[PDB]
Amino acid sequence: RMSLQEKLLTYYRNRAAIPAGEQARAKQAAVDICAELRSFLRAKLPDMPLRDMYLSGSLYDDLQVVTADHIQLIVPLVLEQNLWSCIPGEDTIMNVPGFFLVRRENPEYFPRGSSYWDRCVVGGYLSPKTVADTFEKVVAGSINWPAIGSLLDYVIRPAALTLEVQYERDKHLFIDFLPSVTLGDTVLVAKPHRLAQYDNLWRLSLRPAETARLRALDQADSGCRSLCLKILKAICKSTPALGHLTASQLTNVILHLAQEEADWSPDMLADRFLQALRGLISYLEAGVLPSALNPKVNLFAELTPEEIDELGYTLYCSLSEPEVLLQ
Ligand SMILES: Nc1ncnc2c1ncn2[C@@H]1O[C@H](COP(=O)(O)OP(=O)(O)O)[C@@H](O)[C@H]1O
Protein backbone atom coordinates (compact mmCIF):
# COMPACT_ATOMS: atom_id res chain seq x y z
CA ARG A 1 0.00 0.00 0.00
CA MET A 2 1.30 3.44 -1.00
CA SER A 3 2.21 6.22 1.41
CA LEU A 4 0.50 9.58 0.85
CA GLN A 5 3.88 10.92 -0.32
CA GLU A 6 3.96 8.46 -3.22
CA LYS A 7 0.27 8.96 -4.09
CA LEU A 8 0.92 12.69 -4.43
CA LEU A 9 4.01 12.33 -6.61
CA THR A 10 2.12 9.79 -8.72
CA TYR A 11 -0.78 12.23 -9.02
CA TYR A 12 1.54 15.10 -9.97
CA ARG A 13 3.29 12.98 -12.61
CA ASN A 14 0.12 11.67 -14.23
CA ARG A 15 -2.35 14.55 -13.85
CA ALA A 16 -0.91 17.90 -12.72
CA ALA A 17 2.34 18.05 -14.71
CA ILE A 18 1.91 19.13 -18.31
CA PRO A 19 3.80 17.04 -20.90
CA ALA A 20 7.12 18.92 -21.08
CA GLY A 21 7.11 19.31 -24.86
CA GLU A 22 3.58 20.75 -24.89
CA GLN A 23 4.52 23.16 -22.11
CA ALA A 24 7.56 24.51 -23.97
CA ARG A 25 5.92 24.70 -27.41
CA ALA A 26 2.76 26.36 -26.07
CA LYS A 27 4.85 28.91 -24.18
CA GLN A 28 7.12 29.51 -27.17
CA ALA A 29 4.08 30.14 -29.39
CA ALA A 30 2.95 32.82 -26.94
CA VAL A 31 6.48 34.29 -26.83
CA ASP A 32 6.50 34.34 -30.63
CA ILE A 33 3.20 36.23 -30.90
CA CYS A 34 4.33 38.63 -28.17
CA ALA A 35 7.42 39.73 -30.10
CA GLU A 36 5.51 40.13 -33.38
CA LEU A 37 2.89 42.31 -31.67
CA ARG A 38 5.80 44.33 -30.25
CA SER A 39 6.73 45.44 -33.78
CA PHE A 40 3.14 45.86 -34.99
CA LEU A 41 2.12 48.04 -32.04
CA ARG A 42 4.84 50.61 -32.76
CA ALA A 43 4.26 50.64 -36.49
CA LYS A 44 0.43 50.55 -36.39
CA LEU A 45 -0.81 52.27 -33.16
CA PRO A 46 1.59 55.19 -32.32
CA ASP A 47 -1.59 56.99 -31.33
CA MET A 48 -2.20 54.89 -28.25
CA PRO A 49 0.00 55.37 -25.15
CA LEU A 50 1.27 51.90 -24.20
CA ARG A 51 4.42 49.96 -23.47
CA ASP A 52 5.34 46.60 -24.92
CA MET A 53 2.78 43.95 -24.10
CA TYR A 54 4.35 41.16 -22.05
CA LEU A 55 3.33 37.63 -21.09
CA SER A 56 1.88 36.78 -17.70
CA GLY A 57 0.23 33.84 -15.99
CA SER A 58 0.94 30.32 -14.81
CA LEU A 59 1.97 29.10 -18.27
CA TYR A 60 4.81 31.63 -18.35
CA ASP A 61 5.81 30.69 -14.80
CA ASP A 62 5.82 26.87 -15.09
CA LEU A 63 2.82 26.89 -12.72
CA GLN A 64 0.07 25.89 -15.16
CA VAL A 65 -1.32 22.41 -14.52
CA VAL A 66 -3.11 19.56 -16.33
CA THR A 67 -2.92 21.17 -19.79
CA ALA A 68 -1.08 24.09 -21.39
CA ASP A 69 -3.91 26.09 -22.97
CA HIS A 70 -3.99 29.66 -21.63
CA ILE A 71 -1.87 32.75 -20.95
CA GLN A 72 -2.39 36.52 -20.54
CA LEU A 73 -0.94 39.37 -22.55
CA ILE A 74 -0.66 42.36 -20.25
CA VAL A 75 -1.46 45.64 -22.00
CA PRO A 76 0.33 48.25 -19.86
CA LEU A 77 -1.09 51.76 -20.16
CA VAL A 78 1.19 54.73 -19.64
CA LEU A 79 -0.42 57.20 -17.26
CA GLU A 80 1.24 60.38 -16.09
CA GLN A 81 1.16 61.24 -12.41
CA ASN A 82 -0.29 64.74 -12.88
CA LEU A 83 -3.50 63.50 -14.53
CA TRP A 84 -4.50 60.34 -12.64
CA SER A 85 -4.90 59.05 -9.08
CA CYS A 86 -5.81 55.60 -7.76
CA ILE A 87 -8.23 55.41 -4.82
CA PRO A 88 -7.97 52.35 -2.56
CA GLY A 89 -11.25 50.49 -2.11
CA GLU A 90 -11.34 51.06 1.64
CA ASP A 91 -11.60 54.77 0.82
CA THR A 92 -14.46 54.41 -1.63
CA ILE A 93 -18.10 53.91 -0.73
CA MET A 94 -17.77 50.34 -2.01
CA ASN A 95 -15.34 49.67 0.86
CA VAL A 96 -13.63 46.73 -0.89
CA PRO A 97 -9.91 46.20 -0.20
CA GLY A 98 -8.09 44.84 -3.25
CA PHE A 99 -9.98 47.06 -5.69
CA PHE A 100 -9.23 50.66 -6.71
CA LEU A 101 -10.87 53.62 -8.43
CA VAL A 102 -8.77 55.39 -11.06
CA ARG A 103 -9.72 59.05 -10.86
CA ARG A 104 -9.05 61.57 -13.63
CA GLU A 105 -7.61 64.74 -12.04
CA ASN A 106 -9.39 68.11 -12.08
CA PRO A 107 -10.77 68.45 -15.48
CA GLU A 108 -11.22 72.24 -15.16
CA TYR A 109 -7.41 72.42 -15.23
CA PHE A 110 -6.55 69.37 -17.34
CA PRO A 111 -9.30 69.26 -19.97
CA ARG A 112 -10.47 66.15 -21.80
CA GLY A 113 -7.83 65.54 -24.47
CA SER A 114 -4.76 65.90 -22.24
CA SER A 115 -4.53 62.11 -22.46
CA TYR A 116 -5.55 59.62 -25.15
CA TRP A 117 -7.22 57.60 -22.38
CA ASP A 118 -9.58 60.46 -21.53
CA ARG A 119 -11.85 58.74 -24.08
CA CYS A 120 -12.31 55.80 -21.68
CA VAL A 121 -13.22 57.88 -18.63
CA VAL A 122 -16.71 57.72 -17.10
CA GLY A 123 -17.97 60.10 -14.42
CA GLY A 124 -14.37 61.07 -13.66
CA TYR A 125 -12.97 57.54 -13.35
CA LEU A 126 -10.99 55.48 -15.86
CA SER A 127 -13.34 52.64 -16.82
CA PRO A 128 -11.94 49.06 -16.88
CA LYS A 129 -14.72 47.94 -19.24
CA THR A 130 -14.29 50.85 -21.63
CA VAL A 131 -10.49 50.62 -21.75
CA ALA A 132 -10.92 46.98 -22.71
CA ASP A 133 -13.63 47.71 -25.28
CA THR A 134 -11.56 50.54 -26.74
CA PHE A 135 -8.34 48.54 -26.97
CA GLU A 136 -10.22 45.67 -28.59
CA LYS A 137 -11.62 47.88 -31.34
CA VAL A 138 -8.41 49.76 -32.08
CA VAL A 139 -6.38 46.54 -32.44
CA ALA A 140 -9.10 44.93 -34.59
CA GLY A 141 -9.10 48.06 -36.74
CA SER A 142 -5.45 47.66 -37.80
CA ILE A 143 -4.30 44.12 -36.97
CA ASN A 144 -3.90 41.43 -39.66
CA TRP A 145 -3.99 38.15 -37.73
CA PRO A 146 -3.99 36.02 -40.91
CA ALA A 147 -0.56 37.41 -41.92
CA ILE A 148 0.83 37.33 -38.36
CA GLY A 149 -0.06 33.67 -38.28
CA SER A 150 1.14 33.16 -41.85
CA LEU A 151 4.44 34.57 -40.63
CA LEU A 152 4.78 32.21 -37.66
CA ASP A 153 3.02 29.29 -39.35
CA TYR A 154 0.45 29.54 -36.54
CA VAL A 155 -3.26 29.75 -37.29
CA ILE A 156 -4.57 32.66 -35.22
CA ARG A 157 -8.15 33.87 -34.92
CA PRO A 158 -9.95 36.02 -32.30
CA ALA A 159 -12.92 34.49 -30.42
CA ALA A 160 -13.28 39.26 -28.20
CA LEU A 161 -10.07 39.95 -26.25
CA THR A 162 -9.21 36.28 -26.60
CA LEU A 163 -7.09 34.84 -29.38
CA GLU A 164 -7.19 31.16 -30.18
CA VAL A 165 -3.72 30.22 -31.38
CA GLN A 166 -3.43 26.96 -33.30
CA TYR A 167 0.35 26.35 -33.11
CA GLU A 168 0.62 22.66 -33.98
CA ARG A 169 -2.15 21.43 -36.31
CA ASP A 170 -3.84 19.67 -33.34
CA LYS A 171 -2.87 21.98 -30.44
CA HIS A 172 -4.31 25.26 -29.21
CA LEU A 173 -3.71 28.04 -26.77
CA PHE A 174 -5.95 30.88 -25.63
CA ILE A 175 -4.36 34.30 -25.20
CA ASP A 176 -6.44 37.03 -23.59
CA PHE A 177 -5.38 40.67 -23.36
CA LEU A 178 -5.44 42.09 -19.84
CA PRO A 179 -5.25 45.91 -19.65
CA SER A 180 -3.09 47.15 -16.78
CA VAL A 181 -2.30 50.45 -15.09
CA THR A 182 0.55 51.39 -12.79
CA LEU A 183 0.12 54.44 -10.57
CA GLY A 184 2.99 54.98 -8.17
CA ASP A 185 3.64 51.64 -6.45
CA THR A 186 0.19 50.23 -7.28
CA VAL A 187 -0.33 47.79 -10.16
CA LEU A 188 -3.92 47.30 -11.31
CA VAL A 189 -5.56 45.11 -13.97
CA ALA A 190 -8.93 45.27 -15.71
CA LYS A 191 -10.14 42.02 -14.18
CA PRO A 192 -13.76 42.85 -13.25
CA HIS A 193 -15.25 42.33 -9.80
CA ARG A 194 -17.80 39.51 -9.88
CA LEU A 195 -20.74 41.86 -9.26
CA ALA A 196 -21.94 44.48 -11.75
CA GLN A 197 -22.29 47.32 -9.22
CA TYR A 198 -18.52 47.05 -8.57
CA ASP A 199 -17.72 47.26 -12.29
CA ASN A 200 -16.07 50.68 -11.93
CA LEU A 201 -13.21 49.17 -9.95
CA TRP A 202 -9.76 48.04 -11.06
CA ARG A 203 -8.30 44.93 -9.39
CA LEU A 204 -5.12 45.10 -7.31
CA SER A 205 -2.42 43.02 -9.03
CA LEU A 206 -1.18 40.37 -6.60
CA ARG A 207 0.14 37.51 -8.72
CA PRO A 208 3.66 38.73 -9.55
CA ALA A 209 4.69 39.45 -5.94
CA GLU A 210 2.99 36.29 -4.62
CA THR A 211 4.61 34.00 -7.17
CA ALA A 212 7.98 35.75 -6.79
CA ARG A 213 7.92 35.22 -3.02
CA LEU A 214 7.01 31.59 -3.72
CA ARG A 215 10.01 31.19 -6.03
CA ALA A 216 12.34 33.00 -3.63
CA LEU A 217 11.39 30.70 -0.75
CA ASP A 218 11.74 27.52 -2.82
CA GLN A 219 15.00 28.59 -4.48
CA ALA A 220 16.65 29.51 -1.18
CA ASP A 221 16.10 26.07 0.40
CA SER A 222 15.17 23.85 -2.58
CA GLY A 223 11.72 23.21 -1.14
CA CYS A 224 8.48 21.72 -2.42
CA ARG A 225 6.21 24.77 -2.03
CA SER A 226 5.58 25.07 -5.78
CA LEU A 227 5.04 21.33 -6.20
CA CYS A 228 2.45 21.35 -3.41
CA LEU A 229 0.71 24.35 -5.00
CA LYS A 230 0.51 22.71 -8.43
CA ILE A 231 -1.07 19.59 -6.89
CA LEU A 232 -3.64 21.78 -5.12
CA LYS A 233 -4.31 23.61 -8.39
CA ALA A 234 -4.78 20.36 -10.32
CA ILE A 235 -7.17 18.97 -7.71
CA CYS A 236 -9.36 22.09 -7.69
CA LYS A 237 -9.30 22.34 -11.48
CA SER A 238 -10.22 18.66 -11.80
CA THR A 239 -13.08 18.75 -9.26
CA PRO A 240 -16.26 20.58 -10.41
CA ALA A 241 -17.49 21.36 -6.88
CA LEU A 242 -14.14 23.11 -6.32
CA GLY A 243 -14.37 25.31 -9.43
CA HIS A 244 -14.71 28.47 -7.33
CA LEU A 245 -11.23 28.19 -5.82
CA THR A 246 -8.48 30.23 -7.52
CA ALA A 247 -4.74 29.81 -7.96
CA SER A 248 -4.25 33.04 -6.02
CA GLN A 249 -6.24 31.73 -3.06
CA LEU A 250 -4.26 28.48 -3.01
CA THR A 251 -0.92 30.28 -3.39
CA ASN A 252 -1.68 32.44 -0.36
CA VAL A 253 -2.66 29.37 1.66
CA ILE A 254 0.83 28.07 0.88
CA LEU A 255 2.44 31.43 1.72
CA HIS A 256 0.76 31.54 5.14
CA LEU A 257 1.83 27.96 5.91
CA ALA A 258 5.37 28.83 4.80
CA GLN A 259 5.41 31.57 7.45
CA GLU A 260 4.77 28.94 10.14
CA GLU A 261 6.78 26.06 8.64
CA ALA A 262 10.43 26.41 7.59
CA ASP A 263 11.11 22.80 6.59
CA TRP A 264 9.71 22.23 3.12
CA SER A 265 12.06 19.37 2.30
CA PRO A 266 10.79 16.99 -0.42
CA ASP A 267 10.08 14.48 2.36
CA MET A 268 7.65 16.88 4.06
CA LEU A 269 5.42 17.22 0.96
CA ALA A 270 2.74 14.91 2.36
CA ASP A 271 2.69 16.70 5.72
CA ARG A 272 2.56 20.15 4.10
CA PHE A 273 -0.16 19.11 1.65
CA LEU A 274 -2.27 17.98 4.60
CA GLN A 275 -1.56 21.25 6.44
CA ALA A 276 -2.51 23.16 3.27
CA LEU A 277 -5.80 21.26 3.07
CA ARG A 278 -6.61 21.73 6.74
CA GLY A 279 -5.57 25.36 6.37
CA LEU A 280 -7.87 25.99 3.40
CA ILE A 281 -10.78 24.41 5.28
CA SER A 282 -10.13 26.66 8.28
CA TYR A 283 -9.99 29.86 6.19
CA LEU A 284 -13.31 28.88 4.63
CA GLU A 285 -14.78 28.27 8.10
CA ALA A 286 -13.76 31.79 9.13
CA GLY A 287 -14.89 32.98 5.69
CA VAL A 288 -11.68 35.01 5.42
CA LEU A 289 -8.43 34.31 3.57
CA PRO A 290 -6.05 37.27 3.98
CA SER A 291 -3.50 37.98 1.26
CA ALA A 292 -0.06 37.14 2.66
CA LEU A 293 1.36 40.31 1.09
CA ASN A 294 -1.69 42.54 1.66
CA PRO A 295 -3.34 41.21 4.86
CA LYS A 296 -6.11 43.82 4.50
CA VAL A 297 -7.31 41.99 1.37
CA ASN A 298 -9.72 39.07 1.82
CA LEU A 299 -9.39 36.76 -1.18
CA PHE A 300 -12.79 35.14 -0.45
CA ALA A 301 -14.57 38.49 -0.68
CA GLU A 302 -16.21 37.77 -4.07
CA LEU A 303 -17.59 34.48 -2.76
CA THR A 304 -21.09 34.32 -1.28
CA PRO A 305 -21.49 32.84 2.24
CA GLU A 306 -23.26 29.76 0.83
CA GLU A 307 -20.58 29.18 -1.81
CA ILE A 308 -17.90 29.28 0.89
CA ASP A 309 -19.99 26.83 2.91
CA GLU A 310 -20.24 24.34 0.05
CA LEU A 311 -16.52 24.62 -0.63
CA GLY A 312 -15.85 23.79 3.01
CA TYR A 313 -18.27 20.88 2.97
CA THR A 314 -16.87 19.49 -0.29
CA LEU A 315 -13.37 19.48 1.16
CA TYR A 316 -14.47 17.87 4.43
CA CYS A 317 -16.26 15.19 2.40
CA SER A 318 -13.18 14.61 0.25
CA LEU A 319 -11.18 13.57 3.33
CA SER A 320 -13.05 10.25 3.12
CA GLU A 321 -12.75 10.16 -0.67
CA PRO A 322 -8.99 10.47 -1.42
CA GLU A 323 -9.28 8.57 -4.71
CA VAL A 324 -11.86 10.94 -6.15
CA LEU A 325 -9.76 13.89 -5.00
CA LEU A 326 -6.77 12.36 -6.84
CA GLN A 327 -8.57 11.00 -9.93
N1 LIG B 1 0.13 40.46 -13.83
C2 LIG B 1 -1.09 40.12 -13.36
N3 LIG B 1 -1.71 40.83 -12.38
C4 LIG B 1 -2.94 40.48 -11.91
N5 LIG B 1 -3.65 39.43 -12.36
C6 LIG B 1 -3.15 38.65 -13.33
C7 LIG B 1 -1.82 38.95 -13.90
N8 LIG B 1 -1.60 38.02 -14.83
C9 LIG B 1 -2.68 37.19 -14.86
N10 LIG B 1 -3.62 37.56 -13.97
C11 LIG B 1 -4.94 36.90 -13.71
O12 LIG B 1 -4.75 35.73 -12.91
C13 LIG B 1 -5.63 34.68 -13.32
C14 LIG B 1 -4.82 33.48 -13.72
O15 LIG B 1 -3.96 33.15 -12.66
P16 LIG B 1 -2.93 31.91 -12.77
O17 LIG B 1 -1.90 32.08 -11.68
O18 LIG B 1 -2.54 31.79 -14.22
O19 LIG B 1 -3.95 30.71 -12.38
P20 LIG B 1 -4.31 29.46 -13.34
O21 LIG B 1 -3.02 28.70 -13.49
O22 LIG B 1 -5.38 28.74 -12.56
O23 LIG B 1 -4.79 30.09 -14.62
C24 LIG B 1 -6.42 35.20 -14.50
O25 LIG B 1 -7.75 35.46 -14.08
C26 LIG B 1 -5.66 36.43 -14.96
O27 LIG B 1 -6.47 37.45 -15.51
Q: What is the CATH number of the domain that holds 27?
A: 3.30.460.90
* 146 lies in the same domain as 56: yes
Q: Closest ligand 1 atom to the C-alpha of 246?
A: 22
Q: Closest ligand 1 atom to the C-alpha of 71?
A: 18
Stated resolution in angstroms: 2.3
* 284 lies in the same domain as 200: no
* 48 lies in the same domain as 187: yes
* 12 lies in the same domain as 28: no
CB atoms closer than 10 angstroms to residue 119: 11
Q: Which of 205, 223, 248 is the last residue of a domain?
A: 205
d(CA 146, CA 162): 15
To the question of whether residue 191 is assigned a binding role by annotation, the answer is no
Q: Which of 190, 205, 220 is the last residue of a domain?
A: 205
Q: Whose CA is nearest to atom 11 of ligand 1?
A: 57
Count of structural domains within the chain = 2
Give the domain range for residue 108: 18-205
Q: Whose CA is nearest to atom 17 of ligand 1?
A: 58
d(CA 289, CA 6): 29
To the question of whether residue 205 is assigned a binding role by annotation, the answer is yes
* 103 lies in the same domain as 9: no
Tell me if residue 137 falls in helix, strand or coil.
helix
To the question of whether residue 207 is assigned a binding role by annotation, the answer is yes
Terminal-residue alpha carbon distance, the chain: 17
Distance (Å) from CA 61 to ligand 1 centroid: 11
Tell me if residue 242 falls in helix, strand or coil.
helix
Q: Whose CA is nearest to atom 5 of ligand 1?
A: 205
CATH code assigned at 13:
1.10.1410.40
Distance (Å) from CA 112 to ligand 1 centroid: 33
Distance (Å) from CA 191 to ligand 1 centroid: 9
* 79 lies in the same domain as 189: yes
d(CA 58, CA 247): 9
Distance (Å) from CA 107 to ligand 1 centroid: 34
* 69 lies in the same domain as 82: yes
d(CA 156, CA 232): 32
d(CA 284, CA 273): 17
To the question of whether residue 58 is assigned a binding role by annotation, the answer is yes
* 118 lies in the same domain as 100: yes
Burial class of residue 86 in the structure, from the number of CB atoms within 10 Å of its CB (0-12 exposed, 13-18 middle, 19+ buried): buried
* 183 lies in the same domain as 259: no
* 166 lies in the same domain as 101: yes
CA max distance for the chain:
75
Distance (Å) from CA 58 to ligand 1 centroid: 7
Computed on alpha carbons and rounded to an integer, the radius of gyration of the chain in Å comes to 21
Q: Cα–Cα–Cα angle for 68, 252, 184, nearest 5°?
A: 90
Ligand 1 site residues, Cβ closer than 6 angstroms? 56-58, 63-64, 72, 74, 178, 189, 191, 205, 207-208, 233, 247
Q: Whose CA is nearest to atom 3 of ligand 1?
A: 205
Residues 6+ apart with CB under 8 A from 293: 206, 209, 210, 213, 255
CA 13 to each of CA 7, 69, 124, 227: distance values in angstroms, whole numbers, following the listed order: 10, 18, 51, 11
Residues 6+ apart with CB under 8 A from 193: 96, 99, 199, 201, 203, 302
Q: Whose CA is nearest to atom 15 of ligand 1?
A: 57
Q: Which of 144, 172, 205 is the last residue of a domain?
A: 205
Q: Closest ligand 1 atom to the C-alpha of 63?
A: 21
* 62 lies in the same domain as 129: yes
* 48 lies in the same domain as 6: no
Residues 6+ apart with CB under 8 A from 106: none
d(CA 261, CA 62): 24
Distance (Å) from CA 207 to ligand 1 centroid: 7
- Candidate from 161, 189, 203, 255 with most ligand 1 atoms within 8 A of CB, to mutate: 189
